[PDB]
Design a protein around this ligand. Structure first.
Ligand SMILES: O=C1O[C@H](CO)[C@H](O)[C@H](O)[C@H]1O
Ligand SMILES: [Mg+2]
Ligand SMILES: [Mg+2]
Ligand SMILES: [Mg+2]
Ligand code: NA
Ligand code: NA
Ligand code: NA
Ligand code: NA
Ligand code: NA
Lengths: 1015, 211, 174
């Protein structure tokens, strides 16, 4: 009947014989083991080596497989995605469905994973009680057999499917057969922008419960006005035979101390004309001065739920961690424990570069640590319920969680075609209701989400109300249909900009500041997605945080996103490389658009992470005279693990430093008076830097962890002393093709046909491999290219405007090249025009002054045609012959920083290996820029001025021609790009121009000056 | 939902209609055991949604009902909101769980009395005059059932109508009910007689309570 | 698979292959007929004399009934309640369910009404367009076959269940 019914092409069948959803169970038979959360003899893992065979369709599966192991099958580890063992290709598509849109049907060619396990069951498990199997995650649908007999069927890839195996099992050896389908009608609700994989990718377990059992329990905590008193309310349900001797005890523990306890027989209050629930009981425990849970101090208690007889014989115990906290929206503000939150959030998919969508504790812990170390306090489960351990870890480490139903129908036209259809209400309801039933006792979950990108349909309204009715403790949000529909308690837009309206028809994205005050609007605004961190991105991040801090009802947002969804492939030599869309033969695909993370797949930070850390700081600073004002943004905790280190330096040379303990109340202020600083012995700019340091290790950070910093310019003494007059006078030599200048062991050559410096000599060793030429282009960033889908060739994108205007094609045309001998110098004057098909794009006018001290002063004045698209940069580039080990600069750093992403960078003297001056974005682009640089040192060379630079073994040309970072090859010398000016990188989104007007190079006329010398 | 012709005739002759979903779980213990269970939401939703989809163009239909005697479950709230979203032109009413829950736009009690309170635990039937002015209450009151017309009955009918006329927000009600549910049986001579519960060998039965 | 699935003991299955619900249709091919609400040639009634047999359970239904009229069956008027034709007793109960309260299960002794009809369809309906069958009320659940082939299943006693018969119909007797 299984092949005949085709349950995987019927949205009215989402399960068969599946048990009811419930909070995490372990069926402890000892209360102390429940209290301490130790392992339970009644909960076994079936994880490990299973048997697996791949088939192109369920019709290709032999009947013998149900009762006997296939000899051709392989032994594979479970949990796994079968794409990660190479049985078929993972597919990366964003919006467009990986299957033809013909609901409820899927392709007849539907990859089928046949899993099986031969395993033991002890006789004691079968002599009494109930033995069930739990599949925490099967993608996307499956039938289950046990000992050759059909058990049931399940859909929804991201929540546990449980089945009663009591009547199916024998003492001794037993065999499970699991037929997993890659595609089902469930897939229509699973159109997340991620790799499309399949298999048994989450834990498999066996759970033994007694016949008379705890079948459900809900924990609620309510508070008085000042949170000095709480009532813990615990509703407990049983299954089995009802009896007068039955009792439930809920006890609450803080460490080894029992704080409160209540005991009652079964039988709820009368609720209607037919009485009440005889199979339910509600316990109420008073708790004076509860320790409150927050992401700042994750105070937890332990609730133990004992099912027992009147005289104390235990039947079973369940338990959970309890966090006493209230979440409510009042007067337009989201309040936690009566205080308005500021969400420093990030979206986090479950992704591993080797294991695919299988999650392990180590990876989860690594993520949480990195998130907290970088000043995140919140996470969004984009876009499905997570591995169950995730919530336990967020409970214990302290992160706010948006728990989100596994519903996305992005690729439908229009987006709400299914979600407005009552025929799809049952499938949708189970994704929402079974999530709430599983996760409702986790304190870390503060907000429910109805899913993502599924338009706004009547089904959303129905399910919104269901949650509000079933769990009044948490707000419900949902972004679809314009982010402010009747199905959301919070205005939760994606990539709405700070000041700029994007007034799309029907679903406009208003400036977030504007959105709050639209006539009749009163709700809080928290972006469910913002600051798209794809490649070289997070330009404009500081603008969001300034607005968040200024506007009470702007309460933050969740960055998109945490980790690049790249996957490891191996080349012919067996060396690993990072792969994206299309690299597995998957087609259609959306290329690099799966890589939007603040960290690489292996959790190495992108440069943008530090910009997020700095903007998300919990301490704010002001300077007035000798006084630093420190303001705490903590809502609950005092600064009891913080000291302020301060340092004053003169152009990188340390002058004075000290330490002061921080003693700041939540939302409080502390004034720190700096000692009288000694006056500088020379010219230059004094800089004050402050860092907040955590002396002690925490659960989430090491001793000496830096949590916050800030810099200010102090006194400046401009240099008024002229350089010591030189005896020597540089000599000019003139040929038809060159102007050469010589001074001691130094020589400069200017090509009279090109008009550029073609060579320089130290001794008589050549310094250049390529001439020093103007550059007005950059290897395009992902933000420059501006595509969310591989098929789109968008004329509006920056890269396309540059290409169409001929910026990449423009050839320098020489207008002037003259040489004059001065009293103590040689002056070379040049002028070039860059034209494309008769149009003058740019004019560059330069002077090079070479004096007797060996310094070459370059003055550059550029004209940019007002009607050409604003250029990516205004600078010079050359390939140096030198390959040196180190780069030393006085400027902003140490990490990569761009004009609209430089707030985290500090001004100082930095020294790094050359390789650190390149950022290995998996899709190569312009990278490694450092701004506000007054001095750069590389080998024998020094450049001085006020410029931005990048320095690497890769030319802009190679970077723009190369699609993968592992395909890059170090070129002969060192490519140097020195920019007078450089365009913003943007990032408000990555599929439309996102660079703010103040960071575009639109001034028309540009001036910069550089001194090049040998040190 | 009735035979489709009923709505056509009510349109043309002129009667106001409460169109009601085919959902009643009276015999459950407690009454909301199914209607508060998410497993039964799909079956319940089709009884509501497919009614609205059929009858939403009939002018005679002025109010939707979520069914009767099924307590008050979270499934009622979901479906209440579904209707309000899909068809804002008609109020939604539902009596279960005490006649004034979050799943009803109209206080719609059954057999609430004019002056006399019946303060049952959980689901009290207040005096209708008193019900209207309970703290915070602002909704209209229309009894979905009153004046049980069983046998020699309708004593005190005038008392309802005096109150309906005096109180603006007491906007009437629906008598229980129109027609006796008696069935024709025939005796030895082939003479017809009116039969009720039990007269077909049906057991358990509730006798004349169908009339 | 019909007897094996027991769709009538599963609240997750309320229908199979049932068409979307909609307001009353008549598919007029003349605008003046639509305006005046006169009969439509495209809306036929199948009310009248049908064949009927009673069984104590669906397991008792002979497989031959799918493709051939039962000789022991009676000719009855439809629409009708079969209790009113004396096939079994109507039950009057108020609150207490007529069956043991054990959701989603019903008694094994489940009175089964086997209705059948032989009918002709005019030629032009076979060549073009979509032909559906509408059951305005069936109490309480039913499976449907057309020319021996299974069509679908429906619940809810008080709303129409509609099924596309286009791929099932043939020239002559159906
Ligand atoms: O709006 C979105 O933009 C992201 C683009 O990377 C990603 O597709 C998210 O899943 C989606 O919610
Ligand atoms: Mg299905
Ligand atoms: Mg999407
Ligand atoms: Mg059913
Ligand atoms: Na704010
Ligand atoms: Na993406
Ligand atoms: Na590139
Ligand atoms: Na009145
Ligand atoms: Na009655």
């Amino acid at each position: 009947v299984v092949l005949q019914r085709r349950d995987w092409e019927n949205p009215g069948v989402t399960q068969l014989n599946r048990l009811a959803a419930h909070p995490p169970f372990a069926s402890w038979r000892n209360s102390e083991e429940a209290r301490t959360d130790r392992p339970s003899q009644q909960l076994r893992s079936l994880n490990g080596e299973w048997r697996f065979a791949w088939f192109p369709a369920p019709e290709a599966v032999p009947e013998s497989w149900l009762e006997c192991d296939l000899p051709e099958a392989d032994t594979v580890v479970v949990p796994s995605n079968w794409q990660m063992h190479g049985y078929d290709a993972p597919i990366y598509t964003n919006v467009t469905y990986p299957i033809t849109v013909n609901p409820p049907f899927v392709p007849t060619e539907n990859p089928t994973g046949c899993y099986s396990l031969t395993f033991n069951v002890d006789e004691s498990w079968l002599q009494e009680g109930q033995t069930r199997i739990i599949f925490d995650g099967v993608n996307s649908a499956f039938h289950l057999w046990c000992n050759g007999r059909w058990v049931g069927y399940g859909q929804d890839s991201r929540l546990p499917s449980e089945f009663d195996l009591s009547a199916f099992l024998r003492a001794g050896e037993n065999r499970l057969a699991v037929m997993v389908l890659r595609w089902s009608d469930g897939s229509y609700l699973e159109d997340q922008d991620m790799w499309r994989m399949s298999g048994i990718f989450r834990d498999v377990s066996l759970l033994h419960k007694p016949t008379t059992q705890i079948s459900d329990f809900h924990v609620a905590t309510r508070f008085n006005d000042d949170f000095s008193r709480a009532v813990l309310e615990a509703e407990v349900q049983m299954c089995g035979e009802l009896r007068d001797y039955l009792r439930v005890t809920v006890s609450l523990w803080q460490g080894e101390t029992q704080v409160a306890s209540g005991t009652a027989p079964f039988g709820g209050e009368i609720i209607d004309e037919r009485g009440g629930y005889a199979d339910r009981v509600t316990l109420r425990l008073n708790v004076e001065n509860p320790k409150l849970w927050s992401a700042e101090i994750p105070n937890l208690y332990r609730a133990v739920v004992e099912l027992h007889t009147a005289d104390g014989t235990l039947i079973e115990a369940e338990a959970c961690d309890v966090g006493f906290r209230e979440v409510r929206i009042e007067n337009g503000l989201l309040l936690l424990n009566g205080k308005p939150l500021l969400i420093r959030g990030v979206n986090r998919h479950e992704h591993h570069p080797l294991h695919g969508q299988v999650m392990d504790e180590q990876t989860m812990v690594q993520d949480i640590l990195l998130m907290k170390q970088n000043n995140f306090n919140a996470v969004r489960c984009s876009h499905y319920p997570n591995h169950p351990l995730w919530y336990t870890l967020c409970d214990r480490y302290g992160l706010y969680v948006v728990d989100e139903a596994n519903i996305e129908t992005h690729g439908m036209v229009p987006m709400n075609r299914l979600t407005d259809d009552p025929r799809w209400l049952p499938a949708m309801s189970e994704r929402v209701t079974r999530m709430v039933q599983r996760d409702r006792n986790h304190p870390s979950v503060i907000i429910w989400s109805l899913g993502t990108e599924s338009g706004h349909g009547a089904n959303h309204d129905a399910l919104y109300r269901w949650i509000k009715s079933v769990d009044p403790s948490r707000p419900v949000q949902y972004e679809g249909g314009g982010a402010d529909t009747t199905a959301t308690d919070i205005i939760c837009p994606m990539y709405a900009r700070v000041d700029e309206d994007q007034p799309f028809p029907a679903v406009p994205k208003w400036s977030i500041k504007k959105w709050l005050s639209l006539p009749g609007e009163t709700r809080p605004l928290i972006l469910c997605e913002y600051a798209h961190a794809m490649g070289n991105s997070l330009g404009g991040f500081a603008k969001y945080w300034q607005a968040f801090r200024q506007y009470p009802r702007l309460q933050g947002g969740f960055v998109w996103d945490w980790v690049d969804q790249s996957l490891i492939k191996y080349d012919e030599n067996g060396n690993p490389w990072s792969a994206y869309g299309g690299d597995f033969g998957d087609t259609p695909n959306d290329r690099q658009f799966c890589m939007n993370g603040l960290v690489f797949a292996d959790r190495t930070p992108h440069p943008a992470l530090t910009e997020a850390k700095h903007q998300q700081q919990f301490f704010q600073f002001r300077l007035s005279g000798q006084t630093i004002e420190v303001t705490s943004e903590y809502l609950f905790r005092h600064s009891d693990n913080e000291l302020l280190h301060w340092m004053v330096a003169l152009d990188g040379k340390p002058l004075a430093s000290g330490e002061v303990p921080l003693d700041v109340a939540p939302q409080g202020k502390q004034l720190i008076e700096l000692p009288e600083l000694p006056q500088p012995e020379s010219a230059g700019q004094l800089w004050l830097t402050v860092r907040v340091v955590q002396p002690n290790a925490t659960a989430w950070s090491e001793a000496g962890h830096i949590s916050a910093w800030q810099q200010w310019r102090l006194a400046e003494n401009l240099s008024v002393t002229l350089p010591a007059a030189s005896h020597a006078i540089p000599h000019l030599t003139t040929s038809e093709m060159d102007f050469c200048i010589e001074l001691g062991n130094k020589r400069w050559q200017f090509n009279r046909q090109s008009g550029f410096l073609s060579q320089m000599w130290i001794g008589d060793k050549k310094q250049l491999l390529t001439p020093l030429r103007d550059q007005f282009t950059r290897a395009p960033l992902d933000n420059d290219i501006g595509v969310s889908e591989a098929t789109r060739i968008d004329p509006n994108a920056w890269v396309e405007r540059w290409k169409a205007a001929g910026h990449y094609q423009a050839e320098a045309a020489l207008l002037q090249c003259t040489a004059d001998t001065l009293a103590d110098a040689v002056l070379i004057t040049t002028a070039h025009a860059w034209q494309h098909q008769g149009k003058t794009l740019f004019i560059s006018r330069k002077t090079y002054r070479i004096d007797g001290s060996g310094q070459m002063a370059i003055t550059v004045d550029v004209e940019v045609a007002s009607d050409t698209p604003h250029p990516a940069r205004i600078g010079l580039n050359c390939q140096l012959a030198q390959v040196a080990e180190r780069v030393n600069w006085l400027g902003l750093g140490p990490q990569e920083n761009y004009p609209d992403r430089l707030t985290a960078a500090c001004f100082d003297r930095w020294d790094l290996p050359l390789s650190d001056m390149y950022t290995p974005y998996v899709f190569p682009s312009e990278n490694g820029l450092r701004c506000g640089t007054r001095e750069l040192n590389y080998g024998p060379h020094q450049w001085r001025g006020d410029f931005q630079f990048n320095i690497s073994r890769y030319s802009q040309q190679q970077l723009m021609e190369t699609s993968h970072r592992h395909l890059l090859h170090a070129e002969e010398g060192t490519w140097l790009n020195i920019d007078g000016f450089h365009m913003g990188i943007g990032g408000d989104d990555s599929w439309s121009p996102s660079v703010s007007a103040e960071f575009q190079l639109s001034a028309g006329r540009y001036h910069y000056q550089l001194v090049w010398c040998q040190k």
